Design a protein around this ligand. Structure first.
Ligand SMILES: CC(=O)N[C@@H](Cc1ccc(OCC(=O)O)c(P(=O)(O)O)c1)C(=O)N[C@H]1CCCCN(Cc2ccc(-c3ccccc3)cc2)C1=O
Length: 106
């Protein structure tokens, strides 16, 4: 159950996710998963990043959920659960701004 996950923030807005992630104390890869503001049944993986060009900034990746069961950011790489997706992207940056590291503080 995703509701049970500490990185699942459920129904918060994109702006709020940004407010929480743009904390100077957050290293690259700080993240949270939330409901998409405008797509029923899809989620957003909000991730903090940092470089000298943009400083501290946030990237939002849409996570798709198949009726056929799979979770994915890119259809080429699917998972049986949102937990497995989160675990995979904590080890591989692949197309993300940074691999997932720590859950975002409130
Ligand atoms: C409005 C905005 O910010 N758009 C996001 C997509 C997006 C994300 C969340 C979202 O939330 C709803 C909300 O704000 O509530 C909505 P909305 O519902 O607002 O329309 C739209 C975006 O464009 N992010 C970028 C992220 C950085 C990379 C470039 N890109 C394309 C891409 C390329 C490669 C990969 C990839 C990832 C991992 C491995 C392999 C490939 C992923 C994305 C994005 O999507």
């Amino acid at each position: 159950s995703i509701q049970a996950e500490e990185w699942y923030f459920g129904k918060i807005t994109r702006r709020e996710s940004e407010r929480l992630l743009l904390n100077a104390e957050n290293p690259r890869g700080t993240f949270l998963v939330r409901e998409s503001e405008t797509t029923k049944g899809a989620y957003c993986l909000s991730v903090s990043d940092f470089d000298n060009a943009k400083g501290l900034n946030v990237k939002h990746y849409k996570i798709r959920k198949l009726d056929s069961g799979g979770f994915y950011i890119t259809s080429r790489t699917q998972f049986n659960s949102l937990q497995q997706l989160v675990a995979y992207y904590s080890k591989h940056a692949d197309g993300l701004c940074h691999r997932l590291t720590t859950v975002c503080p409130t």
